[PDB]
Structures are given as C-alpha cells and as structure tokens.
Amino acid sequence: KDKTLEEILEMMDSTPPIIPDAVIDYYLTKNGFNVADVRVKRLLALATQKFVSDIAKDAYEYSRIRSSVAVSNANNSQARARQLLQGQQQPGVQQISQQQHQQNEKTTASKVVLTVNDLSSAVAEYGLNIGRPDFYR
Amino acid sequence: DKHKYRVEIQQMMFVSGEINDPPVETTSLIEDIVRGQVIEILLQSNKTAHLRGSRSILPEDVIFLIRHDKAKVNRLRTYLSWKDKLPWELQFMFNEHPLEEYVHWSDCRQASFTFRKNKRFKDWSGISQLTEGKPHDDVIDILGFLTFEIVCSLTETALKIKQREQVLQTQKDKNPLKPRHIEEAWRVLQTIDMRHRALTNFKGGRLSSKPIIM
Amino acid sequence: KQSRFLANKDLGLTPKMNQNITLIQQIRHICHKISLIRMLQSYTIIDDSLDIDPVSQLPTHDYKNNRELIWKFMHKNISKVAMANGFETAHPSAINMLTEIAGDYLSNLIKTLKLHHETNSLNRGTNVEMLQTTLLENGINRPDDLFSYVESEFGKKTKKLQDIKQKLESFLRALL
Amino acid sequence: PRDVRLLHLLLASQSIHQYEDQVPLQLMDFAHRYTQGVLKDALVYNDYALGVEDIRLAIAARTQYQFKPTAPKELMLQLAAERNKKALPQVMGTWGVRLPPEKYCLTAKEW
Amino acid sequence: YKKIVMSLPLNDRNRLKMITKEAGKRGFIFCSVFQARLNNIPKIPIVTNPESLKRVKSNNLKTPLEWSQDIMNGFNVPLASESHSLPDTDSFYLRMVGIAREHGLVGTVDARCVELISLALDQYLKNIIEFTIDTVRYRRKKYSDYSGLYKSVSEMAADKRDAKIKQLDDDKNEDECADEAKSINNGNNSSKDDIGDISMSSAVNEELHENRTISLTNEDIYDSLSI
Amino acid sequence: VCMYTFQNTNKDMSCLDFSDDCRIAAAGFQDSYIKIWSLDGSSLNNPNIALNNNDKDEDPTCKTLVGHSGTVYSTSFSPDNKYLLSGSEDKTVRLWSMDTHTALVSYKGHNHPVWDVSFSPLGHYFATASHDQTARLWSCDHIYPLRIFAGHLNDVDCVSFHPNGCYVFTGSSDKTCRMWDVSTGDSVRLFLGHTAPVISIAVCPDGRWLSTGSEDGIINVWDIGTGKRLKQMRGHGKNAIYSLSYSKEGNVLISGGADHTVRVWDLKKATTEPSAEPDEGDVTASINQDIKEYGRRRTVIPTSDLVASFYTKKTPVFKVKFSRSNLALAGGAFRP
Amino acid sequence: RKLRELVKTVGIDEGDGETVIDGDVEELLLDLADDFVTNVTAFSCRLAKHRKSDNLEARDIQLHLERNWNIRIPGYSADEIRSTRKWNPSQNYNQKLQSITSDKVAAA
Amino acid sequence: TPEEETTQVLNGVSRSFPLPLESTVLSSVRYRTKYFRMREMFASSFSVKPGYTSPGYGAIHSRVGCLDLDRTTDYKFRVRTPQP
Amino acid sequence: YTIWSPQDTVKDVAESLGLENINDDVLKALAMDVEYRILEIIEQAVKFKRHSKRDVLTTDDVSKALRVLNVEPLYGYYDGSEVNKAVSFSKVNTSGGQSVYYLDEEEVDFDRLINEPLPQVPRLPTFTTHWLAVEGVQPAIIQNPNLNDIRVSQPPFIRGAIVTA
Amino acid sequence: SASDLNRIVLEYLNKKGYHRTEAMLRAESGRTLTPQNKQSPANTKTGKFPEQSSIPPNP
C-alpha cells in the first residue's frame, strides 16, 4: 500500500534525514513561512536529498557512458576475470599480460570526475542550460 | 514515401486491444510517429556515442536513452534471452569484479517490425542518412523492439482515451481509432514529468526540451 | 557545547549513509589490492564531528542565519550524497553548481508551500493537501516514493555493497 | 583574455569602475550561450528556406519571451486607463490604518 | 589617460579596428514612439518592382484594392474575447489572411494550417488548464499505481500563473492576467460595463418639461446607461 | 545631526528607516528579514502586564520579521507608527504590526521587484514603485491596487506624496520625474533637466517647490506651477544622493548621500526670496575649492547654496530624517 | 460554449473529482488564446516570406511551433520540419580542444 | 606614442552604441482591433476637406501604411497624409 | 563594427556548432546584437546595485538582472567564504596563431571536502550612535573624521566639495 | 532647436483650439513663478485641519 503522508511524518519522527535542522531553518527564514513542526522540516530535507540524489545519479550515468574505459570495463569484466583467475601462482604467468598492461595503466589511473561538461548535460535533461564555453579567446 | 509498414502496424495493433480493421489514416499516422521516433532515437544515440569516440553505436548506447524505465529494460533483457551488464550499473563502478484464436493471438505477437531482414527498414527509417559509421551489430533488434513497444503503448492509451471520450459523449447529451485519438494519445504520452520540470518553474522562460521516447 | 547543527548526526539516516560510504570506500580498497596483483602479474576516513569553535556558538553571533556556514553545511551534506553513487573526485565548480541547484530546489519548495498557505483564492486546501500538492508541483509525484528512496538507498544498496564486499573477500581469499 | 579586458573597457565606458572578478566571466558565459542558441536556430531557419535576415529571424524568435519588451508605454497607458476608470472607494475618516476583512489577512490560518 | 596598462595589451589589429567605429553604421530607428506607431498602423502591400509585378500578375493575384478589403475583413472578425467561445474555421481563415496581408503575403492561406492552429490552441490551453487543475487538488488515484468538486477562480489562474510562469506567451495576455485579473471586493464585476459610475447611486431624470427641451449632461449618462 | 551607525552588516543591509518619536528603526536585509531595533534600549517585547512565560529566549532588544522570500529593498513607517510596510523583490508588499511582531496583510499587484513603498501624509493609502515602469496606488484595506501610474520610459525608483496627500511624485531612471493626479491617474507635471537616474525626491512643506537628487550628485529644485528650474545644487560628489529631508518650518535641505557626507542646503539664495542674509567674511570660504590639487576639470565646484557638510568617516548615510526640533537623524551601516 | 468542453476533456471525474471553470477565467483564457493565434501566425508569415513564397503553408506553422513552443504536433509536414544535424564542432575547434587537453596534461 | 593611441582607443569606445536588429513591440490584438474599428467608424463618418488629396486607400479612409511587397524586413515605411 | 568582437569571439562559437564559413556581415550584426544584450543585462545590474545600496557590481547584481530579463541562470559563480572579489580570474593562455585562454581548475577529493572545518561567523548586527554635528560643526570625537585626511584618501568626485561652517 | 519647439507649441495650440489672446495669456501664465502663500505650512492661527469626511481626495 502506498504510504500516506501521516505515516511518512510518523516515520520522520524517528529517522531524521541528512540535511540537519538549521539548514532547513535558514532556507525557511530566507523564504518566509515560519513553521514550527519538525516533521515538515524533515520532509523537505528528505525531498531535497532525494532530488539531488537523482541529479547526481544521472550525472554518474552520463559520466560512465561518455568514457571508453568504463564501457570497456563493463564489456570485458568477466573476460578479464578469466585472466585474473588464470593468474595463479608463478608457474602460469607467461601466457597472460598481453593486454593487461594497457588497461592496467588505463583503469587504475582513471578516477571518476564530476565535471561541469557532465553535470550541464545531466541537468539539461532536467530543464536547465548551463552553457560554459571551453575557451575564451 | 510512406505507407510501407501498414500490415505490420495492424498486426501490432491487434495485440494491444481489438482491431476492427483500422483505417488508412490511423496506420499512416502511427507510421509517421514511429518514423519520427526512430530518427530521434538515432540522433540522440549518435550524439551520445560520438562523444565517447566511436561512430559504431553500441547496444547499450540505445538502452541509455531508456535507462529510467527499469521494468522496460528488464523486458528488453528478457527479450534478449531467446537468441539461441550495463555500463552505468552499481557493480560496474569499481575496477575489478569477482567470478481457438489464442494461437492467432500468439502469432501476431511473433510478428515484428524488422524481424525478417533490415532491407526495407534501412532505407525507410534512413539508417545510413544520419549515422556516421556502421552501427549494425544489435541496434536493429533494439530498434525493432522499441517500435513494437511504441505501437503497443500508443494504441493502448488511444483505446483508453477513445473509451473515455465515448463515456464523455454519452454523458454530455444525457469502434475504429481516428487520427484525433492518436494525436491526443501522443499528447498524453509526450507530457514532461514533474521531476523533469522542477528546476524551471518559478523562473519565466520557454522550456526547450527533447521528444520523449517510449 | 554541542551546536544545533550536529544534533541528528547519529539518528537514522546519517549512520546509514555513513555505512554506505564506508562500504563504497572499503570495496574500493580491495580493488586496489587486486589491481596490485595485476601489476605484479605483468583512504582518509570520514569525520562528521567537525563543529565551528566554541567562541562562535555564543548567542552574540549569528551562527544560525549567515550564508557561509549554511553553505558549508550544504556543501558537506551534498558531497556526502554525491559519493554514495560512486564519485570519488570532483571539480570545485561542479559541487558549487550542485549546491546552487539544491539551494534553488529547497527555496522553490518553501516558496510553493508559502504561496499555498497565503493565497486569497476561494479554494484553499487543508493542512495535508497543501503539503501533498507542494510535493507534487515541484518534485515527487506521490508522497510514497520517499519511503521507496529510503528503501532504495539504505535498504537495498547497503545489502548490494555488502554482498559485493563478501564476494570480493571470498575472491581475495581464493586468489592467495 | 582579450574579452575580459574588452569587457573592462565596456564596463568603464558606461561608468562602472567598481565590480568583482567573475562579472566579465558571467557576461562571457552569457554571450556564448546566447550566440550559440541564436546560431543553432539560424542554421535551422537556413536549412528551411547563412545570411543576416536569417539571424534576424532567429533573434526575433526569442526576443518575444525573455528580454525587455520594446516601447511598452502605450500598452501600459491603455491598461492604466482600464484601471483608472473606477473612481476611488470611500476611505475611513478616523485618521489611521484600516485593515482588510479578516479572511483577507494573514492571521486566520493554521499549521 | 590612465588606462595605459589595460588598453595596450590589446593587439594591433584590435586597436586599429577600434579607432574607427562611430555612430552612423545603421539604417535603423530607435524612437520608441515611432516604433509603437509602426506597430500600430495597418499596412497594405504595394508593388513597384517590375519582376515581382509580373510575378504577382501571372498567379492571378489582384491589385491592392482587394488586399485592403482583406485587411478590413480580417480586422472585422468577432475576435474571441467578445464571443466567449473558441473560434471556428472561417474566423481563423479571415484573421490569418488579414494578418498575411499585413505582413506582405499576397498568396493564399492553406486549409490545413487552420486545423494545425486549432490543435495548437487545443494543446496550449490544455497545458495551462491542466497545470492549474493539479494545484487546487492532489488527485490521489492519479499520479499513483496503488474531495468534491472545485471551480477554478481568477486568483488561482494568477497563482499558478507564477508558480509555473513558463507556460505563457509573455505578451499582453499575461500582463493583463497579472495586472487586472485580481479584483478587490468592491469591484462590481457582474455589471454592464457602465454601472460602476458615481451618478448611478444618486433617481432617473424625467422628460420634456420645457419648450426647447435642451437637457443637462447628467441626464445624457442616464440615457446611455439604458443601452 | 545624530548618526546611527550599524556595525556587523556584511554589505547586506538595504535602505533603513526611523519611526516618528524615533523609538523604532527598521532595516531590510538581503536575506529576507526585517530587523527591528529599539533605539532607546527598551524591552521591545510588549509584555502587557500578565507576563505569561518565556524568559528562556534571548531578547537582545531587537526583533526579526520573517515573511518575505526576496530581498527587502524598501520599508516605510506609518505616521501612526504602529504598522510597518516592507517592499521586497518577491512581488508582494507586506504589512507588519509593530506591537505583536507578525505579518498581517500581503499586497500583490506587481510582477517585478518593489523598490520604494511610501505611506500617505494622513496614513490613508500608500504608493509603490517597481521595475515595471509603473507606480501603483494602493489602500491598506484593499489587497489589490487602486490606480496605475504609467507614462515613464524606464522604471520608477522613488515615490512621494504631496504633503496634503493629493498628488503623487515619481522619479524614474530615464532622467525625469512626474506629478500624478491621485484620482484621474494621469500625469499633471513632467520635470525635465536631469542627466542621471532620479533616486530620491522630496517636496517642501510649503508645497510650491519640488526638490530631487539624481545619481549624478546634483540636486535641483523646480516650482510646480511653472514646471521649470529655479536652480540646482552642485556640492555632492559624482555619486548617488540616497536620501533627502526638509526643515520643519522653512526651507533648509538636508541631503544624505553616498559620498559619506550629510550636506546642508539653503533653498532661498538665487530665487526672488533671499531669506534674510547677514549684514556683515571668512578665511576658509572660497579657498577650499581653490586648492584644486586634483585639477580644475577633475574636481567639484559647489554652488553658493551649500553651507556645511558633515562627513561620516567610511560609513555611508542611507537615511536622513529631520525631527521636529531642529535635530536631524542620519543612519547607515559601517561599511568595512 | 467550447471552452467548457475543453475543460471537460481536461478535467473529468475519473473517480477523483471534477474541476470546473468560472466566467472570469473564461475571459482570461479566451484573451490568452486570442493573442496566441496572432503570435503564432505573425512569425509563421515571416517564415513563409523567408522561404521566398507567397502562400502560408502548414510547414511554417509546424516549424514555428516545434522550434519555439515545442508543442510537437504529429505529422502534417513533420518530415521536412525534422532537420537532422549532428552538431559536431569544426576542425579548428577540435584542434583547440586538443591544445587545451595537452596543456591540461602537461600541467601535471 | 601610446598616449595618442590610448586616447583614440577611448575615443572609439566612446562612440560605439549598439541597436538591436529585431525588437518586438509589446502590444495587443484587442486594443489594435478596437483602435482600428473606432478609427474606421469615425473616419467613414466625417469628411476630409482636402487641399488636393485625401488619405487612405479602398475602404480604409485613414492613415494607412505603405509596406512594399518586397523589403518586408525594413524598419520604416511611408504613410498616407492629405497633401494640398 | 562595435567593441565586442569582429570575429575573434563569436566565430569561435560558430565553429563550436560546426558551421565552417559565414560572411562577416553576419558576424558584424550578430556581435552587435550580442553586446547590446550584454548592455541590456548591465543596465538592470546597475539598477539592482543602486537599489541594494552598494558601490561594487557583485555577481549577485548581474544574477538578479537575469531573473528580471528571464535569462536562464548562470550557475556556479558563488562559493564558500563569500568575500568581496574572491579572486578567481586565473585564466591560462594557450599558444597558436592567436590566443586561447581555458580557465584551469584543480580537481579535489571528496574526503578533503567533507573532512574540512567550518569557517568563522561574525556577530549579529548591532548599532552605535554619536553626534555628527551639534550646531553645524563637528565635535571631533574618535567617531568623527579629520577633514584634512579626506583630501589624501578620496578624489573630489567620490567625496564632493569640502566646506565648513 | 527651442524656437522650433516654440513654433510647434504655438501651432499645437492653434490646432487644438486656443484663441490667440487665450494662448498668449496661457503662455504668460506659464512663464511667471508661483507666488508666496503666507499660510504656507498652514500656521495654527489661520489654518485648519483636513476634513474627516470619509471621501477620497479630489484636486
């Protein structure tokens, strides 16, 4: 059964969200509308947290598609797990490492960077247009 | 030209609801809607795959455009299970991984859009017109499954709004689908979601967006 | 004196998000060991008890309504959720834009509920209906999906990272 | 950059001698997005029928909904004349401030 | 003067360009009174160019005596504020041919773009009405996969005119919906466009008690009140 | 001049105002508060001898008012001094009760930010300035406006009534100001001659002379009958003249601007009214601006109307308010 | 009486309530539609003149409603309106991106 | 010398003023049609008393624009005025 | 021309789309309209600056000339420790036949953004009063200026004419 | 260009229906200054309060 709002506030009575009370209080008194219920503050905290979880997750999808290293790791995942499983004790190393070195300097040197040219497309899905040029001439 | 896929459009209409021999105009409008949707799918997927640095469109690159509908991509994964690992998933962040007419109801479901060969599909939809490379590894099978889902969902909502317009007409004074039913089914299926609008609501500027694919 | 910001820092979603974060980090560490195995076959833990200082918690200071302290707590609580997906490094401008987006979304939520509270139309909704329509008109299309998200991010993702940890631990035990 | 100091000369040409640092950066990132959208819509309008009348169509397409409208004084004069038909109501004569009725005030409300 | 540190690192081509600009580059106008005048006046297309004269004489399109009548007949349509109903095909056709004669198009207006305009108005007003409807109510059965009757008021179509402000033409219509749609409680809305005068509170004047029967101007407004 | 300097405002305090009896000060912040100061160090809690509870809270003789969602750009006190009228950049003007510290009425008639609210002389009905190039007449009992004052080319910056409450004066950013009939709505006077956005306007208690200041540091006076210029005032720096105030009985203009000075002006020097000059010299006169170390064209030359100028040492004056007894009050924020 | 039918097909009961309209809202939405019609056809006439013709065809109106308002009417002439460019940059731009990436890797 | 170059650069920047190529005048349908209708009634009502000519064309009888068939992107045009 | 760009800025966005060669009349008229729109932003920015009672043109004075002119918002010009002119114009040249500046930015970890301490917060506002003048002369308390160091501090266009009673 | 504005003013008055004597007298009325009202802030000997008659103002 889909949860009614009173059940959600009764659960927010026990489990507070990530964004604490005073941040919600500052954004309240910045936008007017002084409210004295702590459960409405926790509900708006959970709503903002869920919305930015969705935006940052869509940024994660846009940053894992737009790199060849990630799609090649997803393609050759168990194919290189075969090579790792055949990477036994030292008799049995000479028949491997024909492909291990290049993706070794690719996959271990690649960290996932939340980028402006990634988030701008992840929120251009959501209605924005964050146009930052790449040089200024 | 047009009117190439009329009998197959009728076959896919039969699986959703009753058929009652739909006219030339409904099949023509569904053909033009699907021909537009395929071009938009190919343009968005080619734009996504060129920036990776590979003109060959991968099979996962078109599942990228429908990544929100988890039930539909689970349906696609079960549909790819009779031919006898997504890059954006939770496991694939980290670097290393461990080790009597019921038969007539069924044969219409086996009838597909591009099941036979991609000969009429390639010059009808124009695969070579906008793709810079050679995408055909499994992009045609997904581009058949997506059009089957588009026609099924479109005639489902057109049937439901035809029934609701019927009860509105019999309540106002007190069989076939038309172009107006397909157009208002399109208007129902092309409304932007509320979460994909939230960040432009208090500022006043005309929302430019993309055609939502089913 | 404990400030009011660090009140619910262990109360039900911050320990679960911390467990998600440390599971992500300690299965990003086994991958480094197996990558070291691949090389031979040729950490900075979290801290949430950071307060301001006891001199600025005095009631002669506006430690509740100035821009920069709230902006720093938004920055911390948004970098605490942009790493539960899988990010581990970011540009500064990306987190700055994401904090601006979260600030504008929360301000739009409060502005919509404010506009529903003080409208002079001949049909005002009740206490629960205004909350439901101010959740609807910006973000979530139903109330229930919040409980889905708490189910999705702290009830499903935690066992996903847990059994990924268990399988990688058994794989490391099977390698050496 | 050439356009940071060109924006310095533009800001100084309109007597703006105190500003922050990211203000010409914001002006450049506005002008980039505006020119990119205008040229994309103009490429559409040139594939339809580049040239200057094409740019005129592409910047008349979006003048209609974002920037400051042109010569709005006669429409505002017409609108004022529609509002200034009604004579003024009767005022209180007890030399103070009178409120609206109680339902039209922000007091009989509940959380 | 004092900008030697800044005006010097511009390159030589840029400075040789920017010691040449002036006023008198254009052929434009900038007097806003004159811009409003040219947006107000009705204009008819004329011909002086000989190639376009033989191009318009070949396709049997007429002289400006017909386009001026088409301007007048496109203006004389009972536009949709007066009729309180959405317009029909003949009204659409006459208004669009009058507008096309205003802009210069001396050809013929197609018969399918009228139906396209009809469906455009349909989806435009359906978007506006739907995002006014789902704000006075939370439809629990909708927006989900498992009270009574409300009328939308003008204050509500001002209240969700701003919570979702992107949905409008941003023309005159939104300006009047923001400016004049909200009425104070002494507004006297259910009226006959004239009964909000001050003299309709102060007594109908009677007639013809005079040899020359010249009357006063406070009786002329009672005379025009009846019509 | 008694100067009220506000200290810990990190450039986020807009224009303020003092009440009459000078007991309450109201300052509009950039983060959507109205801050209310008791200028006497009083309680400002309005206890009403019952005195129920809540000494546990912290009262620093200062109350905050949170009803706006935009930045408060103007604020005006009633002559009754019991109500406050705050105009913001969210498109409302709100009304506050100064004896229970809550909001009473929201006033929605604008679609652009509100820049200058001002009550009537008799407190009947308030006029408003906004970015939409129109001024609007209101009433405190009506939610929506009563008159629309349209006819300016740019947006309206300042608004003020005639002291009888019968005309409205609006100055706008297209180098001009106008006098509006309050009943028929249409403009009666248009005053031309400035060279900058008119930012503060004020009409003398006589009523025959109008004075206003622009962002060029030049004040000037016209007479409302002829509509042309009597004279101008050229002593401020090439900068903004934030406020303006008049002597209670007679004509002495007090201008508090942006160059950190509060200047004093004789209105009756170059006119046909000489206003009783002394019969019989100085040393500092006509040598201070005869130093001109910075250059003749790069300096200001004051009119013969300017007599004194009190500098404030690095705080600017947002408000001048001439009280009844030859004591003016200035007010501003300590800037660094 | 047509606008009551339009709100009728928008707001039905559907087991959750019927929303109706009032007369002042009808005059407001009729003025909105009245200005929308002229605002569409006045730019469509400029597009049809930009196409160097004299007739006002439906491709002008469908293009003007696709690009700006994005109403997305299904096909009347929506195969000529659908223009497909890939919006990939020039060869100077990818050269300058190579220079920027080369400086970003030579900085470390 | 850099001094004359700097003063002539500042002379160049002090003389450049932009206009917009396309500006959409904020107006109405209804006030335009009602202006036209009232002007048509009171233009058909009275006479002209010309010196040599009257303004207007067929069934306008007022000040009417003279936009050409070409140059529809021009910013100004001629109007009709009673010439003596 | 006007002072924005003949081709050197607008053309490098024209190439960002893909458009190879277009005439200089297009770029002339287009850049003229683009910097007219820049001036149209700047004028509402100085209006918001004047009505916010300030002298600099901060980044939130042009970001409120955007919402007024309905422009989509330029996010990412406000960060932690918001000081006046938080210096960030470190744009790095890149060579060629012409100049290219690309605004280098250093990447950073997340665990040095969550394990980073909170800044200082000042006191809440108070006021303090004194006498600026008692009879038209200034009493020369510590709170008054000196009227001779007003010469050596500010030029007479931002301080006006000094006269005394 | 102010004498041409004076001529435009005179032709405007002539076409908007002001007699030559009437336009001359309105010009002479427009030129002279507003004289002095000796009861300028309404001194409390010969000055009165405004009426509290519940009507709006009218100039």
Side-chain angles (χ1 to χ4, degrees), chain A:
Chain A
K1 180 65 182 64
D2 276 19
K3 252 63 180 180
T4 56
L5 206 53
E6 305 308 305
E7 191 72 31
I8 301 183
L9 299 175
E10 207 197 70
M11 194 176 138
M12 281 300 108
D13 175 279
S14 178
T15 77
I18 296 299
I19 317 188
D21 48 343
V23 189
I24 310 298
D25 290 6
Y26 170 69
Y27 274 117
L28 275 168
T29 75
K30 194 203 162 53
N31 301 287
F33 183 70
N34 44 0
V35 79
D37 310 313
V38 74
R39 314 149 298 114
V40 190
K41 301 177 177 188
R42 290 155 160 192
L43 179 132
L44 269 65
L46 192 54
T48 317
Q49 185 211 323
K50 184 245 175 196
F51 203 84
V52 297
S53 167
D54 297 355
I55 294 188
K57 185 159 52 62
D58 294 357
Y60 165 78
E61 333 288 28
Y62 272 63
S63 48
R64 289 309 258 179
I65 278 300
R66 289 172 183 201
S67 66
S68 45
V69 192
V71 290
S72 59
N73 172 46
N75 276 35
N76 318 129
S77 44
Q78 270 208 328
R80 87 184 54 162
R82 291 318 174 276
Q83 292 190 40
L84 264 295
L85 186 45
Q86 297 325 292
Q88 284 97 18
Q89 76 293 335
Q90 306 311 329
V93 64
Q94 59 284 310
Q95 75 271 3
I96 332 174
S97 197
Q98 294 92 0
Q99 197 47 276
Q100 287 181 339
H101 193 276
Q102 294 181 298
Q103 53 97 44
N104 175 228
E105 52 90 18
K106 284 330 272 170
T107 45
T108 63
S110 87
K111 290 205 167 298
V112 287
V113 187
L114 183 58
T115 326
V116 164
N117 268 19
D118 167 88
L119 197 86
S120 86
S121 277
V123 311
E125 184 192 287
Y126 274 64
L128 279 310
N129 185 16
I130 306 189
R132 309 287 309 275
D134 283 334
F135 52 91
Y136 296 95
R137 283 295 289 184

Side-chain angles (χ1 to χ4, degrees), chain A residues 26-32, chain C residues 62 65-68, chain D residues 20, chain F residues 8-16 26-35 37 64-66 68-75 87-90 113-115 242 318 333 335, chain I residues 44-45 47-65 78 82 125:
Chain A
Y26 170 69
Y27 274 117
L28 275 168
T29 75
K30 194 203 162 53
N31 301 287
Chain C
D62 53 334
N65 286 317
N66 78 312
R67 305 184 202 179
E68 274 73 71
Chain D
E20 291 184 354
Chain F
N8 294 145
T9 72
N10 319 114
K11 278 202 178 48
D12 59 349
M13 213 198 71
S14 316
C15 197
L16 79 153
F29 276 65
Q30 293 291 106
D31 291 344
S32 306
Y33 328 116
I34 288 277
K35 273 281 186 174
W37 323 89
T64 175
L65 309 179
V66 280
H68 279 158
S69 81
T71 70
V72 194
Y73 281 131
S74 176
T75 296
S88 174
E89 90 182 0
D90 71 91
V114 169
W115 276 345
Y242 280 161
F318 298 158
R335 193 67 105 178
Chain I
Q44 276 68 242
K47 284 163 177 170
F48 270 77
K49 163 204 91 166
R50 177 192 59 232
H51 291 280
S52 194
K53 292 285 194 276
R54 268 175 314 195
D55 44 356
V56 304
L57 192 86
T58 173
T59 60
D60 308 344
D61 275 346
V62 296
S63 177
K64 285 174 184 157
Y78 164 57
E82 185 211 348

Side-chain angles (χ1 to χ4, degrees), chain G residues 42-57:
Chain G
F43 200 71
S44 298
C45 281
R46 259 191 297 205
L47 288 183
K49 186 88 185 186
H50 187 234
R51 216 195 43 197
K52 284 304 148 291
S53 53
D54 286 344
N55 314 337
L56 191 67
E57 281 90 356

Side-chain angles (χ1 to χ4, degrees), chain E residues 72-217:
Chain E
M72 190 181 182
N73 295 327
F75 271 129
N76 285 338
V77 179
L79 80 166
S81 296
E82 319 170 341
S83 67
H84 308 284
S85 69
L86 301 164
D88 280 28
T89 296
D90 47 351
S91 61
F92 278 158
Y93 178 77
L94 284 157
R95 268 164 58 80
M96 285 154 79
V97 180
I99 279 149
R101 292 310 188 274
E102 279 278 37
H103 285 254
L105 259 56
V106 300
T108 77
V109 162
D110 182 89
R112 308 216 48 86
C113 50
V114 168
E115 192 210 8
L116 185 57
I117 284 286
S118 280
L119 203 54
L121 283 180
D122 264 4
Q123 299 201 198
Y124 184 60
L125 283 176
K126 277 157 106 175
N127 202 36
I128 296 183
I129 285 161
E130 176 76 86
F131 277 162
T132 317
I133 274 174
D134 50 13
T135 67
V136 297
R137 202 191 308 263
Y138 176 63
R139 298 179 266 194
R140 213 269 317 271
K141 300 283 188 172
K142 213 195 173 175
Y143 300 122
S144 198
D145 49 354
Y146 166 68
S147 197
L149 174 135
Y150 296 153
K151 46 179 201 75
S152 301
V153 311
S154 175
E155 283 105 357
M156 189 51 65
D159 277 344
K160 312 302 164 247
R161 188 264 302 155
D162 69 84
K164 281 157 267 280
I165 180 168
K166 80 196 74 53
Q167 312 208 88
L168 269 146
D169 202 7
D170 307 303
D171 212 5
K172 179 254 201 187
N173 46 43
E174 189 259 346
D175 273 346
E176 307 272 12
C177 178
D179 279 20
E180 296 180 351
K182 315 161 305 304
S183 293
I184 46 176
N185 295 318
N186 54 4
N188 186 38
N189 45 31
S190 178
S191 85
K192 281 94 189 172
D193 266 334
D194 207 52
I195 65 168
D197 277 345
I198 54 153
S199 317
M200 317 312 171
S201 316
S202 306
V204 185
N205 296 116
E206 296 319 297
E207 283 285 84
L208 215 64
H209 68 305
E210 173 157 9
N211 188 24
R212 56 214 171 99
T213 193
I214 294 97
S215 164
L216 78 162
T217 173

Side-chain angles (χ1 to χ4, degrees), chain E residues 16-70:
Chain E
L16 265 185
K17 163 198 64 164
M18 73 183 52
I19 65 163
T20 319
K21 330 170 177 299
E22 64 184 85
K25 185 181 178 292
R26 311 133 190 94
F28 295 169
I29 61 176
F30 52 91
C31 170
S32 61
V33 180
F34 187 69
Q35 304 190 46
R37 169 63 167 170
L38 295 188
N39 204 61
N40 220 29
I41 194 166
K43 58 208 88 68
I44 56 171
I46 72 160
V47 286
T48 292
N49 177 262
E51 182 259 354
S52 184
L53 180 83
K54 309 305 172 57
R55 187 195 42 88
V56 78
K57 203 170 61 184
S58 89
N59 291 270
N60 91 309
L61 310 170
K62 273 78 69 177
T63 204
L65 274 299
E66 288 63 29
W67 310 325
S68 87
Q69 286 211 342
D70 209 322

Side-chain angles (χ1 to χ4, degrees), chain F residues 235-258:
Chain F
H236 265 267
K238 297 299 164 186
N239 200 355
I241 309 165
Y242 280 161
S243 183
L244 212 56
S245 193
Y246 261 104
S247 198
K248 183 244 188 169
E249 275 291 348
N251 278 15
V252 163
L253 193 63
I254 306 304
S255 84

Side-chain angles (χ1 to χ4, degrees), chain H:
Chain H
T1 171
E3 199 50 48
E4 304 169 324
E5 173 205 50
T6 301
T7 67
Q8 287 202 358
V9 158
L10 301 199
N11 185 15
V13 186
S14 88
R15 283 169 305 190
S16 90
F17 82 110
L19 292 184
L21 296 146
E22 267 299 300
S23 44
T24 77
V25 173
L26 189 70
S27 55
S28 184
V29 192
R30 324 191 313 123
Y31 294 121
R32 187 161 134 85
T33 66
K34 285 171 184 187
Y35 154 73
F36 180 78
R37 281 175 195 162
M38 200 91 51
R39 186 178 31 112
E40 282 307 311
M41 161 186 286
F42 288 92
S44 44
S45 295
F46 299 99
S47 174
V48 173
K49 185 64 176 66
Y52 182 69
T53 50
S54 87
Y57 211 58
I60 286 298
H61 300 285
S62 79
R63 292 183 178 182
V64 62
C66 270
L67 170 85
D68 272 29
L69 183 43
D70 55 57
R71 57 211 66 180
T72 197
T73 48
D74 281 23
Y75 296 95
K76 88 168 79 169
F77 42 86
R78 209 173 144 184
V79 302
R80 262 82 184 254
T81 287
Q83 316 288 146

